[PDB]
């Protein structure tokens, strides 16, 4: 990685490899001069300890450190831990087409729909918008479309209504616990910058409006929209899966 400048901040794998290669080279040099036995023995031990560090630092005694005093990260640590590839990039992945904001109430909603600010909508459904623009023919290439949606000329709002009308979006609240932590809603464009949420659903999200934040995702493919409508809609969940008693109880 290049930091700000012509300097490269330390990278732990390359460090470990560099160490092992230096030890290997020096010991290769000793084994062409009939070197003395104590020195070749000491150097074999150094190479062994270096490879042990490389494979799995720290399982031996005092782990090496590179910055000042923190053990640098070896391959077993690229895999293990709360931050190995398993629990960090193969189960929970960062996702495109997402977004987030603060929630607020708006009691004028039918319970199968949620407000969603204009700017988040126009930022999330950009590809769909491009499609509909160059389908109507208001812009030939893709770059004309990009200019138009960036300048926010007054056609994109009608375009955006038509690409929203019947298109569920998944709302989520941060510490998701039970399978009601993700639900679907149909969007309704709003002014302002806060996601509005029907009041009979804070019981499920455990969301008071004292500043909670909710994240929205967009289902892309057609099967996925049908799932967000037939399995994850807000209406389709009016009974908790733990106990039978309702979970849309007025609060």
């Amino acid at each position: 990685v290049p930091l700000d400048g012509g300097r490269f901040a330390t990278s732990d794998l390359n460090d470990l490899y560099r160490r092992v290669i230096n030890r290997n080279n020096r010991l290769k040099r000793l084994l062409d001069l009939a070197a003395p036995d104590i020195i070749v023995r000491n150097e074999k031990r150094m190479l062994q300890e270096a490879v042990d560090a490389l494979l799995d630092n720290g399982r031996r005694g005092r782990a090496i450190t590179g910055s000042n005093k923190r053990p640098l990260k070896s391959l077993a640590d690229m895999i293990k831990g709360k931050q190995g590839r398993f629990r960090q990039n193969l189960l929970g992945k960062r996702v495109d087409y997402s977004g987030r904001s603060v929630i607020t109430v708006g009691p004028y909603l039918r319970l199968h729909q949620c407000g969603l600010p204009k700017k988040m909508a126009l930022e999330l459904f950009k590809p769909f918008i491009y499609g509909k623009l160059e389908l109507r023919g208001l812009a030939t290439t893709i770059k004309a479309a990009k200019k138009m949606v960036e300048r926010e000329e007054a056609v994109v709002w009608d375009i955006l209504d038509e690409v929203i009308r019947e298109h569920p979006v998944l709302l989520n609240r941060a510490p998701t616990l039970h399978r009601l932590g993700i639900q679907a809603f149909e969007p309704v464009l709003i002014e302002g910058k806060a996601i509005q949420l029907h009041p009979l659903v804070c019981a499920a999200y455990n969301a008071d409006f004292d500043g909670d934040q909710m994240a929205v995702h967009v289902p892309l493919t057609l099967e996925a929209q049908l799932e967000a409508r037939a399995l994850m809609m807000s209406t389709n969940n009016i009974l908790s899966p733990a106990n039978g008693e309702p979970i849309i109880v007025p609060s």
């Binding site: 616990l177 908790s240 733990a242």
Partner: protein, 302 residues
């Protein structure tokens, strides 16, 4: 703490009372954080052992079934038979207590109508099918899982019950944790009640009693798990209590008692070592300083 606050927010609080309240609230916060960590780790473990489990067949075709009875703690029946066996496939047909009048066939789904029938006909034991004894390979058949929740009808073929189960178990551990504070620092403590105050006319039934008749003509209990029960005037079991060791029974077994008739009486802060024989006492293997210690009352001189 053994020094309770004796004032309420509408009244002031002097500084000391408020300081004690601080003890309490910092309990609240600390426990939220750390016990949150615990509960989260718990749900993780659960959903990683209960994962590879998916309803896969419409009917295994067996006959094992666990038993289901109402659960009582000593007051009102806590979780009655209707609440326990709502929505679960009956293993073996329930005979009306008019024996040989088979009331429900042996693969019905006890939905709400059947629960009302069971409640009317006053049944207190149903043998019902259960996942733990389902004979399907690699999964669980539909019926043996019983009624789905979150939907009325029976479970479908696919709905991954492993994960939903693991979450619904581990969830209210976390949700209550991160909330345990905003009751305040109050102390959810209840006394042992020191006596079993029966509530309604009925008869008595003891289970696992090994008693003995003390000098004063009473009956003390020298058995560990002794469980007392109040039966009603129709045969139904209405009450169950845990009578601790060494407690004093008023009435023996099989005697009609009525309401408000204290039957048991013990000391809630002492596990006595009551005998069963009568005679003199010698200390065996009791050497001072090594095992026992020998204190003396200045006041009584003893």
């Amino acid at each position: 703490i053994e020094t309770p606050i004796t004032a309420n927010f509408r009244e002031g609080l002097n500084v000391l009372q408020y300081f004690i309240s601080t003890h309490g609230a910092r309990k609240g916060l600390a426990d939220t954080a750390l016990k949150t960590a615990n509960s989260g780790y718990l749900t993780r473990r659960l959903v990683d052992v209960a994962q590879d489990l998916v309803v896969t067949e419409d009917d295994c075709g067996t006959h094992e079934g666990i038993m289901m009875t109402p659960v009582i703690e000593g007051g009102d029946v806590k979780e009655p038979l209707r609440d326990r066996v709502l929505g679960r496939v009956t293993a073996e047909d329930v005979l009306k207590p008019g024996t040989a009048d088979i009331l429900v066939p042996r693969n019905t789904l006890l939905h709400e109508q059947w629960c009302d029938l069971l409640e009317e006909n006053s049944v207190d034991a149903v043998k019902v099918r259960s996942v733990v004894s389902c004979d399907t390979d690699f999964g669980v058949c539909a019926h043996c899982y019983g009624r789905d929740l979150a939907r009325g009808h029976i479970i479908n073929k696919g709905e991954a019950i492993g994960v939903i189960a693991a979450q619904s178990i581990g969830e209210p551990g976390t949700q209550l944790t991160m909330r345990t504070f905003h009751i305040g620092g109050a102390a959810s403590r209840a006394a042992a009640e020191s006596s079993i105050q029966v509530k309604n006319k009925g008869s008595i039934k003891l289970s696992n009693v090994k008693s003995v008749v003390n000098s004063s003509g009473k009956l003390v209990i020298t058995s560990r798990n002794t469980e007392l029960k109040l039966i009603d005037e129709f045969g139904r079991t209405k009450e169950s209590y845990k009578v601790p060791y060494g407690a004093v029974l008023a009435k023996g077994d099989g005697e009609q008692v009525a309401g408000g008739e204290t039957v048991a009486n013990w000391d809630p802060h002492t596990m006595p070592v009551i005998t069963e024989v009568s005679g003199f006492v010698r200390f065996t293997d009791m050497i001072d300083g090594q095992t026992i210690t020998r204190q003396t009352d200045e006041l009584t001189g003893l």
